[PDB]
Amino acid sequence: MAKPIADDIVVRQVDVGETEQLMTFLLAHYYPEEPLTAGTHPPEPEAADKEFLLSNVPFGTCFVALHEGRIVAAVVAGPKDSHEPEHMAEEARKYAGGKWGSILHLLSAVETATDVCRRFSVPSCLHVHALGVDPQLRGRNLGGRLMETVAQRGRDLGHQLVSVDCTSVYAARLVQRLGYQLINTLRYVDHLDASGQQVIRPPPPHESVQTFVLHL
Ligand SMILES: CC(C)(COP(=O)(O)OP(=O)(O)OC[C@H]1O[C@@H](n2cnc3c(N)ncnc32)[C@H](O)[C@@H]1OP(=O)(O)O)[C@@H](O)C(=O)NCCC(=O)NCCS
């Protein structure tokens, strides 16, 4: 139920009843800086974006770090299988024209390219959809501890693989030191929509989305 990872930080599982405080934290410290969100307009995520993240909570695969009764970091993960490339591609279509559509446009291209259940001959993968740390607590292994917690949850659940799309260079550096394997790089300047326009325009130093996997 509770994993002390410092003297004052506790890692807890998110319950289906406590999602508002998780979304408040994400809206403050995940979405404004996450490169796909920051690289598309308007700045704030669409309802369908926020609702998709929260739809992972029933899986028991979402975790927060608590300091003095408050969320200071969070990770949102959920399962996927070999249907995910077809599903994401049709979801990207459904929302084409808006912000969530643009985000899905990129993420679907990456999912199709990586296709990790077919790639590594595994029946399923635990995919990390969001990772955020309060800026005042960054550099203190909170991202790492949350990722390790997802990996252990993945092990209990029988998953043989964890995947994550590091849209941020800081997340790429984190999972590199956790020993993840880089399997795909897509530079944002290389990803166009059908009209030939760059879909995602995030601030430097975020130049690419780098997808990593960890074998469990
Ligand atoms: C990605 C993220 C969770 C990593 O934070 P973290 O786990 O605390 O990062 P690390 O422990 O690996 O810190 C390594 C160094 O990089 C810095 N660092 C981490 N994130 C940073 C960020 N957005 N911006 C600038 N520096 C950052 C740390 O302060 C630390 O530097 P220091 O040792 O001199 O103090 C965090 O950057 C974040 O929440 N970003 C906003 C949301 C986002 O982009 N999520 C993408 C998920 S793919």
TrEMBL record:
Membrane-spanning residues: none
Protein name in UniProt: aralkylamine N-acetyltransferase
Chain ranges of the N-acetyltransferase domain: 9-204
Residues that coordinate or bind CoA 1: E33, L131, V133, G139, G143, D165, T167, Y170
InterPro entries named in the record: Acyl_CoA_acyltransferase, GNAT_dom
CDD domains: NAT_SF
Binding locations of CoA 2: L131, V133, G139, N141, G143, D165, T167, S168, Y170, R177
Gene3D superfamilies: 3.40.630.30
Keyword Acyltransferase: yes
